[PDB]
Amino acid sequence: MVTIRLARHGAKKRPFYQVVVADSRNARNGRFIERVGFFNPIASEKEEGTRLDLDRIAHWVGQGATISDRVAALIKEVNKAA
Amino acid sequence: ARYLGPKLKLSRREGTDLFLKSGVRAIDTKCKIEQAPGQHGARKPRLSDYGVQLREKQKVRRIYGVLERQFRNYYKEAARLKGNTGENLLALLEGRLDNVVYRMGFGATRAEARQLVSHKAIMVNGRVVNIASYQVSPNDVVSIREKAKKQSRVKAALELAEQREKPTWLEVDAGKMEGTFKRKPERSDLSADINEHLIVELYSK
Amino acid sequence: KIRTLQGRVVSDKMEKSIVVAIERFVKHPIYGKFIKRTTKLHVHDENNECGIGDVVEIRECRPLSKTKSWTLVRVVEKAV
Amino acid sequence: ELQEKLIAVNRVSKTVKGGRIFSFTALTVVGDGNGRVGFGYGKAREVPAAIQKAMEKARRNMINVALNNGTLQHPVKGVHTGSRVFMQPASEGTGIIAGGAMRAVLEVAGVHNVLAKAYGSTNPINVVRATIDGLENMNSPEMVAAKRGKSVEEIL
Amino acid sequence: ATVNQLVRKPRARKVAKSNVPALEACPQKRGVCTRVYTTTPKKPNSALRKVCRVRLTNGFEVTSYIGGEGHNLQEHSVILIRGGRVKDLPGVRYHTVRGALDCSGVKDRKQARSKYGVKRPK
Amino acid sequence: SMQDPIADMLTRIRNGQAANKAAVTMPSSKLKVAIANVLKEEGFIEDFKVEGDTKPELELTLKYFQGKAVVESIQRVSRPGLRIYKRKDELPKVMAGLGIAVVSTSKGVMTDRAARQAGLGGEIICYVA
RNA sequence: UAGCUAGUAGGUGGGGUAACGGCUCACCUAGGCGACGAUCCCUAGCUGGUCUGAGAGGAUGACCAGCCACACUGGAACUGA
RNA sequence: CCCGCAGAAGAAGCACCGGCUAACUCCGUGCCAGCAGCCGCGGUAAUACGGAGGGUGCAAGCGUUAAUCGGAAUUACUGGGCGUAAAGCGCACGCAGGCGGUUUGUUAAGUCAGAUGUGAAAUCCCCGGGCUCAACCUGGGAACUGCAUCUGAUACUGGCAA
Ligand SMILES: [Mg+2]
Ligand SMILES: [Mg+2]
Ligand SMILES: [Mg+2]
Ligand SMILES: [Mg+2]
Ligand SMILES: [Mg+2]
Ligand SMILES: [Mg+2]
Ligand SMILES: [Mg+2]
Ligand SMILES: [Mg+2]
Ligand SMILES: [Mg+2]
Ligand SMILES: [Mg+2]
Ligand SMILES: [Mg+2]
Ligand SMILES: [Mg+2]
Ligand SMILES: [Mg+2]
Numbered sequence A: 001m002v003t004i005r006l007a008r009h010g011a012k013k014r015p016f017y018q019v020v021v022a023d024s025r026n027a028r029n030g031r032f033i034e035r036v037g038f039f040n041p042i043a044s045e046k047e048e049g050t051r052l053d054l055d056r057i058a059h060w061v062g063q064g065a066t067i068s069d070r071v072a073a074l075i076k077e078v079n080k081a082a
Numbered sequence B: 001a002r003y004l005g006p007k008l009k010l011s012r013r014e015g016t017d018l019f020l021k022s023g024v025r026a027i028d029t030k031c032k033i034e035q036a037p038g039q040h041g042a043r044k045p046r047l048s049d050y051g052v053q054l055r056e057k058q059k060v061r062r063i064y065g066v067l068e069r070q071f072r073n074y075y076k077e078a079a080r081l082k083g084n085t086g087e088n089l090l091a092l093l094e095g096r097l098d099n100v101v102y103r104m105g106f107g108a109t110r111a112e113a114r115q116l117v118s119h120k121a122i123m124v125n126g127r128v129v130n131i132a133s134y135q136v137s138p139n140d141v142v143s144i145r146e147k148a149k150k151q152s153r154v155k156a157a158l159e160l161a162e163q164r165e166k167p168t169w170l171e172v173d174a175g176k177m178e179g180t181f182k183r184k185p186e187r188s189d190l191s192a193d194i195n196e197h198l199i200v201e202l203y204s205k
Numbered sequence C: 001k002i003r004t005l006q007g008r009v010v011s012d013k014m015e016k017s018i019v020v021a022i023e024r025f026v027k028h029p030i031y032g033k034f035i036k037r038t039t040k041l042h043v044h045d046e047n048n049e050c051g052i053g054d055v056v057e058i059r060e061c062r063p064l065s066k067t068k069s070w071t072l073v074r075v076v077e078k079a080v
Numbered sequence D: 001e002l003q004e005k006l007i008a009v010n011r012v013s014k015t016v017k018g019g020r021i022f023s024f025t026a027l028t029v030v031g032d033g034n035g036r037v038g039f040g041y042g043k044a045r046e047v048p049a050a051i052q053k054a055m056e057k058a059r060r061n062m063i064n065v066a067l068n069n070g071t072l073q074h075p076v077k078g079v080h081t082g083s084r085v086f087m088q089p090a091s092e093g094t095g096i097i098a099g100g101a102m103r104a105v106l107e108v109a110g111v112h113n114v115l116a117k118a119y120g121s122t123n124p125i126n127v128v129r130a131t132i133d134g135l136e137n138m139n140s141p142e143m144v145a146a147k148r149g150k151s152v153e154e155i156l
Numbered sequence E: 001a002t003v004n005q006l007v008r009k010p011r012a013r014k015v016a017k018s019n020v021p022a023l024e025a026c027p028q029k030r031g032v033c034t035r036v037y038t039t040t041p042k043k044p045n046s047a048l049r050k051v052c053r054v055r056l057t058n059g060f061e062v063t064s065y066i067g068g069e070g071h072n073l074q075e076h077s078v079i080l081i082r083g084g085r086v087k088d089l090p091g092v093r094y095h096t097v098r099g100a101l102d103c104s105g106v107k108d109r110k111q112a113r114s115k116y117g118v119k120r121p122k
Numbered sequence F: 001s002m003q004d005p006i007a008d009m010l011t012r013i014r015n016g017q018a019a020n021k022a023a024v025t026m027p028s029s030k031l032k033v034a035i036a037n038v039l040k041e042e043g044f045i046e047d048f049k050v051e052g053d054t055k056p057e058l059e060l061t062l063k064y065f066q067g068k069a070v071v072e073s074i075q076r077v078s079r080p081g082l083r084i085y086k087r088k089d090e091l092p093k094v095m096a097g098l099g100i101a102v103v104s105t106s107k108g109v110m111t112d113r114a115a116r117q118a119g120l121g122g123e124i125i126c127y128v129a
Numbered sequence G: 001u002a003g004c005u006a007g008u009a010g011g012u013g014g015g016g017u018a019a020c021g022g023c024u025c026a027c028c029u030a031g032g033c034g035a036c037g038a039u040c041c042c043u044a045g046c047u048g049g050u051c052u053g054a055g056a057g058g059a060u061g062a063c064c065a066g067c068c069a070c071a072c073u074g075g076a077a078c079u080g081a
Numbered sequence H: 001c002c003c004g005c006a007g008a009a010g011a012a013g014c015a016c017c018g019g020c021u022a023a024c025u026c027c028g029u030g031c032c033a034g035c036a037g038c039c040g041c042g043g044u045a046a047u048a049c050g051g052a053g054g055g056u057g058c059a060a061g062c063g064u065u066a067a068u069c070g071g072a073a074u075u076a077c078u079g080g081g082c083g084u085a086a087a088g089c090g091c092a093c094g095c096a097g098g099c100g101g102u103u104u105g106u107u108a109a110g111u112c113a114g115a116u117g118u119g120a121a122a123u124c125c126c127c128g129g130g131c132u133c134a135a136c137c138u139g140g141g142a143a144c145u146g147c148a149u150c151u152g153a154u155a156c157u158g159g160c161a162a
């Protein structure tokens, strides 16, 4: 039901996703419960590129929230690089 | 989107040398600078206050080669920034890339500087910047790429710039054809014949 | 510590029911004048004690009828 | 050193048995751009004579304004007949934001940054009188501290 | 003026009325010309102004002025009208748009060509 | 009927200054005494005193500097028909600090400068310039 | 547009609902709302916001987002969390 | 996005010029034709009609129309008036309502101070970052002037008692 996934903001051809925990039934860019970070696929050097609040994500997962595949890969990458 | 007409006609109508010619000759030897253009030029126009404000704004615009929409955006930004609105507007205009390359001397006029910038002769911080209105920041380095460093107009304009007065907020090496934007200029460094307050009032009407 | 209101009984002509009036002193949004405003409530009073003119403390509770959702707590200045 | 400015010139008339007689009136304002300003009203048969007489009359009867660095000490209100004027000090660089008569008087008196607005009738003569009156009935920290028996630091 | 009085009866705005009601807040309207004729202006003017009575697509019948020097307008011609009143001509509150559906551009114009629907001469 | 004694007091002060009277007298109350104390400490009147056991009369000795009246303008702000209350942030600046507004805060009546320094709001009795 | 309201306002009991309840029924009481605008008529999706304005305000509710209502017109239930 | 070829070669229009409002002369017409936001123009010298030259303002746009706010302090809370300009009921009594001389005590309702929760994100604003710049996108903050609760102050207003 409650999931953690990416909402696609930004401009044409330059995506910028917003990692938010939301009810699965809502629209992709629609109603969400909480924002837990961001992910810029076209990020350049010296830019964060990916910021995830691991504490809140852990809280929601413990409450039963699911993690979309891409968000899982982002979490893996973050915990592997740092 | 660019004024392609006679430049000395503008200089006469504003009644002042706007530096639209290279400076090899005198503007009095190139035109009748004392007479406004057109058939009824000898007339003595008793321009009103709105007239003087408009003439000042047009003088600054015709000095810098900036159209009205972009100039008004400049004014909005300057008024938004902290400090003094007129000095901020003149600071932005001086921070224009065309203006910078003209000041350092890789161009006889600002039209020639703009032509270089457009035709990709100029590099800021090592990258070719095509956009003429690009705002150079303090400590930026503006150098001419070699394939246009060979061009003779650069050399001739450099000699003319050495002939002219030198800016105090820019440091240039002609042999390397590179310059540094040391700091934002001030009203002490900007020509005191401009009256920015007229422009401020005009755009606040 | 329970959120309660304090008002004046306006009528007691119903069985196990009174209509109190809470008076609130509120600044007018536009003109800044402080204007008196009244809200009329129906209050459930078991034992039918409260008479017209009393000052009553009321607490909001679960619905008890179509229009009654406030219940009596105590009576202050029971003298009419 | 006195900057001078003509605000308005009008053609008034006086009906006589033989016809109409048209004369010209000129309102001018003079000032030293450093806190002294006066206005003059001059009447003549011709415009040059009228402006000359008005300039002389305004060069006389000047008054002193307590200017603080080219700006007003505090908001002032002025009124003469049906013209009511409001003047407020403003930060450096805003320029002089005022209508024509107020613009002329303040520019010649030396105020460089001020927010102004005229209510009621904008008849130039009364607007000039009202703004000059408001500029004159303005008190500075020095005089206010002296008047209340305090120090300027005590007044802040 | 008293605060209490304004509380009991707030300031009530004067309701603006439009000067071109037959347009119904539209920039232009199509109509079918019902009678082309000439009229006489109010004095201090003297001329023969060209006007047309038009039935609009929303049911209104209105008088519209035909500016310029020369019109091919006759009965049953479909024209486009816009707001704008001819001050010295009572009852006329609209203009016909020259260069629009059937109002042809006035011949032999070199200025205000966009205002009179005249193409650029070659 | 007299329904704003504070406004009456300010009106007597204004009229006495316009009529070049040495001193003015009015019926006393503790709010009036507090206001007169504030005016005296801010230097707008030369002195005040109270005379009387059962019906006290407040006498204010007014101040003139160069022939002209010291109080240039004084206007009641909060009035019975419209009470004015201001939070500490929105306390007014009268004549850009050259004058003083008398504010009644929870710790007594004081000037706007004193209330802003003490971090308090309150009712706005009057402006004095 | 100055009076509106008989399930109308409240109460006891039964039934009904996932849930309180005139939600419904029987009986009893004669109430309830209204000049702080009830009822009636006209217009209208609401908001974050957008434009303007020095501000207070005025107009406004396209796109984006939250909520509501509708699915040719009127009515009704079934399946199902 | 970068590199190479060719050659100024493929690329300037719209409105206006009597005052308000920046920018004026000639010719044609002659209360006609026509212009017009307002004032207004035209009856034989028209800077106001039509063309030309010149000029002014914007510029891949420029004008006209429609609509909202502003200017309009012209519904005035901020911020208006009522002898004669529009505007004090013929006059009085008076219910509801609005306002309340002075002192002390108590309460803490209005009022003020602090804290907590909330005031979705986006939007506006500030400091930065990324698209060659800008538009645009975006990190953080501030704001969301509000509401509710708790703890205090009691001057003023309100309640109560004398
Ligand atoms: Mg463009
Ligand atoms: Mg119910
Ligand atoms: Mg005289
Ligand atoms: Mg007027
Ligand atoms: Mg039951
Ligand atoms: Mg509808
Ligand atoms: Mg305004
Ligand atoms: Mg609305
Ligand atoms: Mg079922
Ligand atoms: Mg002119
Ligand atoms: Mg002629
Ligand atoms: Mg319009
Ligand atoms: Mg208004």
Ligand SMILES: [Mg+2]
Residues within 6 Å of the ligand: H080, H081
């Ligand atoms: Mg009036």
Ligand SMILES: [Mg+2]
Residues within 6 Å of the ligand: none
């Ligand atoms: Mg009358």
Ligand SMILES: [Mg+2]
Residues within 6 Å of the ligand: none
């Ligand atoms: Mg009478």
Ligand SMILES: [Mg+2]
Residues within 6 Å of the ligand: H100
């Ligand atoms: Mg009292």
Ligand SMILES: [Mg+2]
Residues within 6 Å of the ligand: H108, H109
């Ligand atoms: Mg309290």
Ligand SMILES: [Mg+2]
Residues within 6 Å of the ligand: none
């Ligand atoms: Mg950048």
Ligand SMILES: [Mg+2]
Residues within 6 Å of the ligand: none
């Ligand atoms: Mg942002």
Ligand SMILES: [Mg+2]
Residues within 6 Å of the ligand: none
């Ligand atoms: Mg928000």
Ligand SMILES: [Mg+2]
Residues within 6 Å of the ligand: none
């Ligand atoms: Mg008391």
